[PDB]
Design a protein around this ligand. Structure first.
Ligand SMILES: Nc1ncnc2c1ncn2[C@@H]1O[C@H](COP(=O)(O)OP(=O)(O)OP(O)(O)=S)[C@@H](O)[C@H]1O
Ligand SMILES: Nc1ncnc2c1ncn2[C@@H]1O[C@H](COP(=O)(O)OP(=O)(O)OP(O)(O)=S)[C@@H](O)[C@H]1O
Ligand SMILES: Nc1ncnc2c1ncn2[C@@H]1O[C@H](COP(=O)(O)OP(=O)(O)OP(O)(O)=S)[C@@H](O)[C@H]1O
Ligand SMILES: [Mg+2]
Ligand SMILES: [Mg+2]
Ligand SMILES: [Mg+2]
Lengths: 386, 258, 325, 319, 261, 261
DNA sequence: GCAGACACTACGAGTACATA
DNA sequence: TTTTTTTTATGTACTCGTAGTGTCTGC
């Protein structure tokens, strides 16, 4: 069935030794799932960001013979292997994977009865049946009442006897904010380029296509360390007309270039800090900053971060002219928002995307600014409401 | 070429209403012996084993063994329009993507032909559930449905305890405690209401109410139901139909015993 | 028979031969109708140029009176045109055939710039899929409010402003049909104050004929309230030729005597400063100051102070122009 | 019978009749001849041939099973959160017997109109049933499609069609329709097309129906010259603080009947990609937004656009 | 002076509940022969032709011919609070806007005079062809409503065929197909439940289920409905009211294209 | 000391629902004759009087002329927790700042006490003139509620006319006029259905609809209703609630249009 | 003949967003 | 290597929860 399936499914890992994630996260998830071995399998013996995880793996158990963090929340950018890690780690620890993803109904009653089905009963095969590990994929799109249902099931003192592992893409969702305080938080770093280059070499040599490690490194750079996007791009670009991959096919924007939603701190860093030493022209930096600030989204938070961070830099303008024209640009955005929300004319909403890039023309430095998250406007509004 | 002429649509209606909210798919296995359906939930909570032999149909033609993976709701949509007492021709080809059902449901010579598209369901294999049950009792189906509804009125789960005496049902809630004690009811004229006990080694388990109600929704399918339960083996209810086959429901107990 | 109608509705070009200006576009649409090759049309232009009249004349030419209600679906901004309407009545009208007689149907979407972009995105495959069965005509004034995917699917005709040379015979037809005594200066004033818009030409003609009984230059400029060219020339000469107080007194007396408004004075002075051979630094300052004054008149501001600022904008540049030499 | 217009009559039915984007179309030809095509999202300008390429690929892959092995959904359909859960997933689960290397194809045309939740529900039904069904999405704005869907598909990007690529298809249509022409008329059709094959075919059909001959005068009598190439000269004049020629271009655009909103939109679109100083570009964009607020308020005259031009000329001579 | 008198209020309630989600506005054409109403739907796909005879009313007078265009949601709200056993008087003057509906309460004590304001729609008259149809089928209305409701669960567009055998309904949907074929059901004790075939040439045409389900709401008006079908003229649903008049529904077929293959 | 007992709990459970959205507070005046409530609405249009005599209570203790002021946003939630056929006791001390309502739980096993803070409001009695009305009529209560509800779908304001023929309700809107009349209903078995006239001078006044619907929210308290009108006196709606007392509603008319010449 | 239960659509309500 | 919240005023669109209500089953 070589001509029947995708290369992302033909080269999917079927064992723990074939995973492409960070080894620390794999070991932490496996140790967290083996902390359930006493309650689930009835056996005493199973066979910085790192420091908190290693402490919570060695923190012990509650007197109900369970981990005190009963939910493992998995976070990261798309295409890293989070679903693959959850399924491989669950099938490796003797469990049976029960999936509940975003393609289901996700109403607070259907979510409730599906969790009660998945976790509150034993196997219908009797003895020898594998336990159920409830994998909840795409929890960041669930409503807040579904998260409340999940937490009420998690905090019944009706006792939860089976592990639950949740997978999300953005950990800072407003529906998961109570979950992060209660979950074994595993954040996925981007995959190592050398490991992905070696894996793409293995895939291309299995498919009989020749490629240098340089063009595969360029493809990994293009797709922002996405395994699935790189393998799909190789599957399209190889075909069977030609054998050897060319560097200009990867360098071209026709195949393999997808839109990446930028983080807020990455956008503030690329606005305030110049790139380190082509790309040295000011026009390319102008267009790059404009497109990154447009592709991030959440425009009001970007404006608040610019307003709260631009006076904390090592500003070279001692005459305060750059600060004055930046405040003029901020007042320009505010007037545009007011006029668009007053006259119902939202074609005025194409100019405030040029507010961040103006800051990039004003306060771009070669230093390393410590960008903080904006809180002053929201704290002031809450205090004014009080 | 597969043809099965079910003599009455009542049994098909009661089966597809019994497992309407129970299983998400129907996997009909077609052989020369009859039609088999061994389906399991995705969370491994309930199991359905339905067998309809070839003698229970008006006709039965089966050239090759077939696997009909079909949607539950798409067939409930069909037999919401079927007839209670009418002949139902369930037919399919050897290598086809469709499954046809021909009937004359309103008794008004209204020739209805309803087709379905198959589901491509992965071939999971469940060979034989082991049957070495210590406690085998017999009960009427209607009284079981009534007591399951009475438990559903109060609680959310049933504590079921077998005994040489009979089967005790318990349920607890904030409103109150619902409890009955089954007695020997063999001194009646009806043979369906007689409770026959062939048990040893009494077992007390806890089961979900919703799956028990879905199992006992098949009360008019058979007059008498058989209960088979033991320690660490899931509970079986069994409806023996009169001439077509039999139906087995398997329910896994709760982890929190008592 | 006679009816109580406005002259922009009493005199509507029911046929394509009664429209005056866009002769190449109308010839192409007439050859579309005659060859039975009518495409999805996109009629865009300034108001009062005859786009709705064009599509109504085409609909009356294509279909008879006994079948007109089954072939034409006309929707405008007074009707609900949400995405439920595109997926509902419009899609069912497109996907079904006719009732009485065979033929292709016509969906007219007047004022299509007022549609939401969800409805415009739902319109795309309705237009593309049922091209043989039904035809679509979008009419707009702003082409930027229609998505480029809908602009690709329709052949677009720009109904530009009506030139005053071709505007005269239709006005002469309306004058002869209403028994109106008009002079040549009255017709010149009509085609000047209309500015490529037959609606306001007919409205000003009807208003002047009701107010005065005759249509001359004095009656048109009195009924409209517009200042004459000699008044604007006098205002510019006073602003450029003498001091602040005398020019202020003369302009104030002219505005009080004739009842002029500052918006029309600003418009005509703006038209005049591009004709007067000013230096480029003077012209930029004059345009910026006059745009500021025109923006200040849009709210509750005293018109006397804005008139003084209009005088001030030229009293600043007088010395600069003379010292430039 | 009613004859279709040349956009719909001369829609390509084979993938080798599609001009432009030669490498991507050639790889789609290889995939249609062989099979086992990955999930695909085609993005690009309107009128490039994305829907044509997707439909031709689906037809060439499926053959006679196109009626039962293809699910085509548009923006004219519902395709909300309840349709991705119930209809798309049931089609992905549906048994369809196909030859080797061929899968079911769920064409989701114009995928920008789908909401975020429907695209979130699309992810797991894309990933699970990939050995029996495939996805072919077409879009204009690729940022409207979320990043999990773009990771789950091969993102093909179509570029705007060049002059020779449209000229080859125009020569094919002209030789089919026996249309007399000159070279200047075909150049005018290319000029009014602006990289769009739909507009090229529409303008050719309009000129041939109205006049019967394709020279520059017959094209420009019914079609129109493009806006931003003329706006760019006015912006270049405003950069050099030449107010007279900028007002000449502005008054020429005003007497053509263009509204102030279309003119200021073209001015902003030119000033986004203009070649000048970045701080001067930001000053220009801020002045354009300040004028556009007045346009949206209700004051939209020729004096206001002239004041905008005068302020843009002031921004040059104000260091 | 126009003054009609519906003998009972149930027939007007059934008519205005059949047309409520279909007809935009009611154009009552008034003559000495009766009351005519030819109105298209909002989508310009369906057509409703209602004809009420003068002999069906209690008292019917009409001096000069009228054409009253009135709103339908207002008339629906008027007829919602109307009885099924009471007389309803429709009044209209020569040059007024008040169309008066005069009836009694369900308490049967107080009068109720509800005026409506007439509209000015001046719509052109649509010509009914009144030609012969290649298929005429008499069938019960309840069975037609039941089969349309059963076909609405499978698909959205229904291919209805008719031949020498009988009428056949097909709904190729997403679950699958539903093919229901009924013929020669005249061998019952009832007279309404019968399927009769009158004309010859078989026709297959596809229609929307929404308009058919809207047409089936006139089931309490007539026990037996008539279906007229041909290859060019549209689908006609003819309800023959017992002693008042008749109701014709015209539905246009959908555009279907075969595969190129 | 104020200490009162009710004979039926449904009196409060029918009289506080009309005052839920009508008046913002309930001010009770305590005297030896009974409890008197006079409350004017926030828009100064409606005036509610409620006089419940001391002979109707199960027991009644009143030593000093006191006035209590309670809110509605808490009493409406408290009343829904109470039963229907139980007994309600109202208690208020001489110097305390709270009002206690003691009743039985709907489970009929425990006694429920609810306390409400006494709002110290500074009001003055407006003073009804109690003059001779130019029109007095008697109507059924539920029929008047159905009449006021049927005019809600037509216009935002109603017109009440009262000649010697009877009482005419009119509702002129954009849809059309809705006119109903009641006259000479003495030939019925029920005594509460007697629509009678009592005065001579006809009166025609336009009133609001929302306030009349709020007035007809208190219909099952009494059997009949009384309507009093004059040329300039506001409309008086009188309910005779059983034996303990009566309730009066005052509704001001609207400003008439300039129809002179 | 009349009470209990089933699914049906209409309607209330919360939320997001609107550009290139 | 750094995260909590409701304002902008309409119009539209989507999604979900709730409530009359027509009709079927049963004793
Ligand atoms: N070691 C590996 N070698 C090759 N392919 C792999 C490997 N690990 C994972 N993959 C594939 O790469 C993809 C990983 O993405 P998934 O784990 O399925 O989803 P995800 O990582 O959670 O990202 P999102 O947010 O769901 S898009 C899948 O298509 C896997 O089959
Ligand atoms: N070209 C024309 N020839 C003759 N009369 C015209 C012409 N254009 C406009 N008119 C007159 O103006 C009236 C209104 O013109 P319309 O056809 O409504 O123009 P329009 O382009 O639709 O304007 P908008 O954009 O809808 S406000 C017509 O009824 C005629 O009386
Ligand atoms: N590359 C091309 N080669 C030949 N004809 C083309 C090409 N692109 C477009 N056309 C013609 O233009 C018509 C429209 O093409 P489509 O593929 O529907 O446009 P599109 O690429 O989908 O753009 P949008 O975003 O959907 S408006 C086709 O029917 C062809 O007649
Ligand atoms: Mg995943
Ligand atoms: Mg118009
Ligand atoms: Mg397309």
């Amino acid at each position: 069935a070589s001509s029947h399936c995708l290369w992302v499914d033909e080269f999917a890992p079927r064992h723990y030794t074939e995973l492409l994630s960070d080894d620390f996260t794999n070991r932490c998830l496996l140790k967290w799932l083996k902390l359930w071995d006493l309650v689930v399998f009835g056996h005493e013996r199973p066979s910085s960001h790192e420091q908190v995880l290693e402490e919570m793996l060695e923190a012990g158990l509650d007197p109900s013979q369970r981990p005190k963090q009963k939910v493992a929340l998995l976070c990261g950018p798309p295409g890293l292997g989070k679903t693959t890690l959850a399924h491989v780690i669950a099938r490796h620890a003797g469990y049976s994977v029960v999936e509940m993803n975003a393609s289901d109904d996700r109403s607070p009653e259907v979510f409730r009865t599906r969790i009660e089905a998945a976790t509150q009963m034993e196997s219908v095969l009797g003895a020898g049946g594998k336990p159920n590990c409830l994998v909840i994929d795409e929890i960041d799109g669930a409503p807040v009442a579904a998260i409340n249902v999940l937490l009420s099931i998690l905090n019944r003192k009706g006792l939860l006897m089976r592990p639950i592992i949740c997978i999300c893409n953005d950990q800072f969702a407003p529906s998961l904010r109570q979950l992060k305080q209660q979950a074994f938080l595993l954040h996925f770093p981007p995959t190592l380029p050398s490991r992905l280059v070696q894996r793409l070499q293995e895939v291309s040599l299995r498919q009989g296509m020749r490629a240098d490690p340089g063009v595969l490194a360029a493809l990994c750079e293009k797709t922002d360390n996405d395994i699935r996007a790189c393998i799909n791009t190789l599957q399209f670009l190889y075909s069977r007309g030609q054998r050897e991959l060319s560097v200009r096919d990867v360098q071209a924007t026709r195949v393999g270039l997808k839109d990446q939603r930028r983080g807020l701190f990455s956008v503030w860093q690329e606005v305030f800090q110049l790139p380190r030493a082509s790309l040295t022209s000011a026009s390319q930096r102008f267009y790059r900053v404009l497109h990154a600030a447009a592709s991030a989204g959440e425009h009001e938070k970007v404006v608040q971060g610019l307003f709260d961070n631009f006076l904390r830099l090592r500003l070279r303008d001692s005459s305060l002219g750059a600060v004055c024209v930046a405040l003029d640009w901020l007042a320009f955005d505010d007037l545009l928002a007011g006029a668009a929300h007053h006259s119902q004319s939202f074609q005025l909403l194409r100019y405030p995307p040029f507010l961040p890039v103006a800051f990039h023309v004003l306060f771009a430095s070669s230093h390393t600014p410590r960008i903080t998250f904006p809180s002053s406007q929201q704290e002031a509004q809450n205090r004014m409401s009080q | 070429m597969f043809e099965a002429r079910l003599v009455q649509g009542s049994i098909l209606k009661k089966v597809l209403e019994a497992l309407k909210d129970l299983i998400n798919e129907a996997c009909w296995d077609i052989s020369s012996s009859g039609v088999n359906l061994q389906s399991m939930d995705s969370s491994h909570v309930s199991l359905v084993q339905l067998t309809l032999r070839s003698e229970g149909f008006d006709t039965y033609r089966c050239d090759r063994n077939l696997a009909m993976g079909v949607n539950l709701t798409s067939m409930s949509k069909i037999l919401k329009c079927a007839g209670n007492e009418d002949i139902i021709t369930l037919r399919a080809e050897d290598n086809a993507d469709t499954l046809a059902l021909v009937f004359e449901a309103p008794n008004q010579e209204k020739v209805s032909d309803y087709e379905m598209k198959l589901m491509d369901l992965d071939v999971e294999q469940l060979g034989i559930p082991e049957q070495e049950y210590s406690c085998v009792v017999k009960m009427p189906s209607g009284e079981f449905a009534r007591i399951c509804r009475d438990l559903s009125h109060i609680g959310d789960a049933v504590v079921i305890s077998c005994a040489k005496d009979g089967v005790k049902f318990s349920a607890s809630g904030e409103l109150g405690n619902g409890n009955i004690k089954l007695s020997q009811t063999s001194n009646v004229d009806k043979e369906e209401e007689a409770v026959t006990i062939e048990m040893n080694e009494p077992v007390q388990l806890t089961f979900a109410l919703r799956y028990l109600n879905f199992f006992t929704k098949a009360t008019p399918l058979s007059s008498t139901v058989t209960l088979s339960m033991s320690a660490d083996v899931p509970l079986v209810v069994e409806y023996k139909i009169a001439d077509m086959g039999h139906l087995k429901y398997y329910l896994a107990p709760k982890i929190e015993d008592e | 028979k006679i009816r109580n109608l406005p002259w922009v509705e009493k005199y509507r070009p029911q046929t394509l031969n009664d429209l005056i200006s866009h002769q190449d576009i109308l010839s192409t649409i007439q050859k579309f109708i005659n060859e039975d090759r009518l495409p999805h049309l996109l009629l865009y232009g300034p108001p009062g140029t005859g786009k709705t009249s064009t599509i109504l004349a085409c609909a009356k030419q294509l279909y008879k009176d006994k079948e007109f209600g089954s072939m034409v679906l006309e929707l405008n901004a007074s009707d609900d045109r949400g995405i439920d309407i595109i997926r509902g009545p419009i899609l069912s009208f497109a996907s079904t055939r006719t009732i009485f007689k065979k033929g292709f149907k016509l969906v007219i979407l007047d004022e299509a710039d007022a549609m939401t972009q969800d409805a415009q995105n739902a319109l795309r495959r309705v237009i593309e899929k049922f091209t043989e069965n039904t035809r679509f005509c979008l009419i707009c004034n702003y082409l930027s409010k229609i998505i480029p995917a809908l602009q690709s699917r329709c052949t677009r005709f720009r109904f530009g402003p009506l030139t005053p040379e071709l505007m005269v015979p239709r006005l002469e037809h309306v004058v002869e049909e209403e028994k109106v005594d008009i002079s040549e200066d009255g017709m010149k004033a009509l085609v000047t104050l209309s500015s490529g818009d037959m609606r306001r030409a007919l409205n000003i003609l009807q208003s002047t004929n009701m107010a005065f009984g005759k249509v001359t230059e004095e009656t048109v400029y009195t009924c409209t309230g517009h200042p004459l060219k000699s008044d604007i020339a006098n205002i510019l000469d006073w602003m450029l030729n003498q001091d602040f107080t005398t020019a202020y007194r003369n302009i104030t007396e002219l505005k009080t005597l004739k009842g002029l408004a500052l918006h029309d004075i600003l418009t005509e002075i703006h038209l005049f400063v591009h004709r007067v051979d000013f230096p480029s630094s003077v012209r930029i300052h004059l345009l910026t100051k006059m745009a500021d004054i025109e923006y200040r008149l849009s709210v509750g501001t005293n018109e006397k102070i804005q008139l003084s600022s209009l005088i001030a904008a030229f009293q600043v540049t007088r010395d600069l122009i003379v010292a430039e030499a | 019978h009613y004859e279709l217009p040349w956009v719909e009559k001369y829609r390509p039915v084979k993938l080798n009749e599609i001009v432009g984007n030669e490498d991507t179309v050639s790889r789609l030809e290889v995939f249609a001849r062989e099979g086992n095509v990955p999930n695909i999202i085609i993005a690009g300008p309107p009128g490039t041939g994305k829907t044509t390429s997707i439909l031709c690929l689906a037809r060439a892959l499926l053959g006679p099973a196109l009626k039962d092995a293809m699910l085509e959904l548009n923006a004219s359909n519902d395709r909300g959160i309840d349709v991705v859960r119930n209809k798309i997933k049931m089609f992905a689960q549906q048994k369809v017997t196909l030859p080797k290397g061929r899968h079911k194809i769920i064409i989701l045309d114009e995928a920008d109109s789908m909401t975020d939740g429907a695209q979130q529900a699309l992810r797991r039904t894309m990933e699970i049933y990939s050995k029996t069904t495939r996805f072919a999405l077409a879009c204009n704005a690729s940022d409207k499609i979320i990043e999990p869907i773009q990771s789950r598909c091969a993102v093909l990007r179509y570029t705007k069609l060049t002059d020779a690529q449209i000229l080859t298809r125009l020569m094919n249509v002209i030789e089919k329709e026996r249309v007399p022409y000159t070279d200047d008329g075909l150049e005018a059709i290319i000029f009014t097309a602006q990289g769009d094959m739909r507009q090229a075919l529409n303008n050719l059909q309009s000129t041939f129906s109205g006049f019967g001959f394709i020279n520059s005068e017959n094209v420009f009598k019914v079609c129109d010259e493009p806006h931003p190439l003329l706006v760019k000269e006015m912006i270049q004049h405003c950069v050099n603080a030449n107010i007279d020629e900028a007002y000449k271009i502005l008054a020429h655009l005003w007497h053509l009947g263009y509204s102030p909103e279309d003119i200021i939109g073209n001015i902003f679109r030119v000033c986004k990609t203009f070649q000048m100083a970045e701080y001067l570009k930001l000053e220009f964009i801020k002045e354009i937004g300040y004028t556009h607020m007045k346009i949206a308020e209700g004051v939209n005259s020729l004096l206001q656009m002239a004041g905008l031009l005068a302020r843009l000329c002031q921004k040059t001579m104000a260091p």
